């Protein structure tokens, strides 16, 4: 009996994430859908490389929304450019819902699995993935006839509990019962990350600018005054030195206050700013005439 081991990882390329999230956020109020291009290289990993967006239709996210003529023409056109990949699966956004599958999504994944029994389905929520966290969970239908054996039919491995823990938000909608998650792994390599780091890279001009001296002096004076008040507080606290269980005194007055947190951390920032400014100024007086 063939089985999808939990060590099977669906490889998503760097381009795939940016384009899939872009498609999700472009048609965010509705549920967008599209077809993912990839290769079933082996049993224990499913690699997707590129993806193209299925045009939005009033049906929503269903097998009807898949337009045969559009996908056929797109596949033929992409074949000439140097992308002879095979239909590897489908993705659809779940705005604010989370990472799970509806009954209609269940049937849609079933229809995809008819062509190939590793047709993965992934979900991308553009709203929850608003920061460094990207909520994207891949799913493949588990056959309802496999209840006699163990669901998640995996075999010798150790990566079932790693990289994720089955979410409560998705467990109640059916996990390890009708569909099971697949560990997500992103194929990022050099010559791709380096191009991506240019999002916020500054330039040669940055690092030599002297900021503005008027507001630099204003900020320095403000930080010095706040340090003077904090030093008054430090003097009071230290000179208090109350000895009725001083260890408990240090734990009954923890509210992110005077002693050290609003201490040298502020000295840290002012000293960093001052040394950086002075070093930059000296470097400019050296280089520029």
């Amino acid at each position: 009996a063939p089985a999808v081991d939990t060590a099977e990882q669906v490889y998503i390329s760097s381009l795939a994430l940016l384009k899939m999230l872009k498609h999700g956020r472009a048609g965010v109020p509705m549920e967008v859908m599209g077809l993912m291009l990839g290769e079933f290289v082996d049993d224990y990993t499913v690699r997707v490389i590129d993806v193209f967006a299925m045009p939005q239709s009033g049906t929503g996210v269903s097998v009807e929304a898949v337009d045969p003529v559009f996908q056929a023409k797109m596949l033929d056109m992409l074949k000439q450019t140097g992308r002879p990949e095979m239909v590897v699966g489908w993705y659809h956004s779940h705005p604010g819902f989370g990472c799970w599958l509806s009954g209609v999504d269940i049937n849609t994944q079933q229809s995809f699995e008819a062509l190939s029994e590793r047709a993965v389905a992934v979900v991308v929520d553009p709203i929850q993935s608003v920061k460094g966290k990207v909520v994207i969970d891949a799913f493949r239908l588990i056959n309802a006839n496999m209840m006699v054996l163990g669901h998640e039919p995996r075999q010798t491995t150790s990566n079932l509990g790693h990289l994720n823990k089955p979410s409560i938000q998705a467990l109640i909608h059916g996990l390890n019962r009708h569909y099971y998650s697949i560990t997500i792994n992103y194929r990022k390599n050099e010559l791709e990350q380096k191009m991506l780091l240019n999002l916020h890279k500054k330039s040669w001009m940055e690092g030599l600018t002297l900021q503005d001296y008027s507001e630099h002096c204003k900020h320095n004076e403000s930080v010095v005054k706040e340090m003077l008040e904090l030093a008054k507080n430090y003097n009071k606290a230290v000179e208090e030195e109350d000895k009725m269980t001083p260890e408990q005194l240090a734990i009954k007055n923890v509210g992110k206050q005077d002693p050290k947190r609003h201490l040298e951390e502020h000295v840290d920032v002012l000293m960093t700013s001052n040394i950086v400014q002075c070093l930059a100024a000296m470097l400019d007086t050296v280089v520029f005439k």
């Binding site: 048609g27 965010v28 109020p29 939005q56 705005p95």
Partner: protein
């Protein structure tokens, strides 16, 4: 061809419109900082909302109606004050050109 040209341009405008999405009409009630506002939807909760870059900070005074995006929850453009014959006082009565 010409009539087809006009109606096809109109149909393409309609096709572009189909992608366009709505904004919740909201009202600014406070300005915490120069990127922070307290906008209340017409019938909805209050959200801490930012402003689009191509928008003047000053114009969004307390009481300025706005139409923020309903996914990112960020102001996109100002709207003038709502007008309706909902006034409960006699001001809307015209004395008559006598």
């Amino acid at each position: 061809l010409k009539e087809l040209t006009k109606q096809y341009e109109k149909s393409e405008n309609d096709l572009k419109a189909l992608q366009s999405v709505g904004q919740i009409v909201g009202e600014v009630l406070k300005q915490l900082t120069e990127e922070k506002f307290i906008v209340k939807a017409t019938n909805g909760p209050r959200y801490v909302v930012g402003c689009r870059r191509q928008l003047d900070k000053s114009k969004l005074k307390p009481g300025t109606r706005v139409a923020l995006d309903m996914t990112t929850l960020t102001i996109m453009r100002y709207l003038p004050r709502e007008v309706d014959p909902l006034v409960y006082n006699m001001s809307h009565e015209d004395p008559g050109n006598v």
